[PDB]
Amino acid sequence: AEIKHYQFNVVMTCSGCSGAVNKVLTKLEPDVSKIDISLEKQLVDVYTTLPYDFILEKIKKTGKEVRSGKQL
Amino acid sequence: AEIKHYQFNVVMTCSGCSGAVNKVLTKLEPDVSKIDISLEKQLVDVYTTLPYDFILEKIKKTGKEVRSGKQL
Ligand SMILES: [Cu+]
C-alpha cells in the first residue's frame, strides 16, 4: 500500500519521444503504476509500488537517455 | 549462418526517436550489422542472423510505432 514517487529527467524532444515512453510505461505488468509525463519539462513522474531500479531499467531499455532520477 | 536483410518503417519524428532505435539495435551486435537508420525516410535497415520477430520485438521496446517491415 505504500506509493513511491519517482521522477526521471529523460531526454524527450518530440511528442513521439514522450508518447513512446508513455506507451512502454503504461503497458508495464503488473498494473501497479500511474505515469505522468511532461514533454515540456522533460520529466517522467512514476507513482508505483515497484522499486526504483526496476522502473529506471524499463525506461533505459527504451533507448532514451535518462539524465537523472530520484525518489520524492 | 543465413544473414537476412530487414527493413522497417518506424515512426521516428526526431533525432531522439532515431537515436533510441539506434541504441537498442547496437546492443544486438554482433548479431546485427550495417545498422542504417534514416530519420528522413523513417526507415531502419539492418543485416542480421536473428529472426525477424526477435528484431521486431526489440525495436518495439523503444515504444515507437512500427508501421511495416520487409525482408529484402
Ligand atoms: Cu522524438
UniProtKB/Swiss-Prot annotation, chains A, B:
Transmembrane segments: none
Major place of residence: cytoplasm
A GO term, aspect molecular function: copper chaperone activity
Signal peptide (from-to): none
Induction of its expression: Expression is induced by oxygen. Expression is also induced by the iron-sensing trans-activator AFT1.
HMA domain residues: 3-67
Activity control summary: Tetrathiomolybdate directly and reversibly down-regulates copper delivery to secreted metalloenzymes.
Subcellular location: Cytoplasm
Gene Ontology cellular component annotations, sorted alphabetically: cytosol
InterPro entries for the chain: Copper_transport_ATOX1-like (IPR051881), Heavy-metal-associated_CS (IPR017969), HMA_dom (IPR006121), HMA_dom_sf (IPR036163)
Entry superkingdom: Eukaryota
One biological process term in Gene Ontology: intracellular iron ion homeostasis
Family as reported in the entry's similarity comment: Belongs to the ATX1 family.
Function noted in UniProt: Copper homeostasis factor that specifically transports copper to the secretory pathway for incorporation into copper enzymes destined for the cell surface or extracellular milieu. Shuttles copper to the transport ATPase CCC2 on a post-Golgi vesicle for eventual targeting to the cell-surface high-affinity iron uptake protein FET3. Protects against oxygen toxicity.
Subunit and interaction comment: Homodimer. Interacts with CCC2 via the copper anion.
Name under which the protein is recorded: Copper chaperone ATX1
Organism: Saccharomyces cerevisiae (strain ATCC 204508 / S288c) (Baker's yeast)
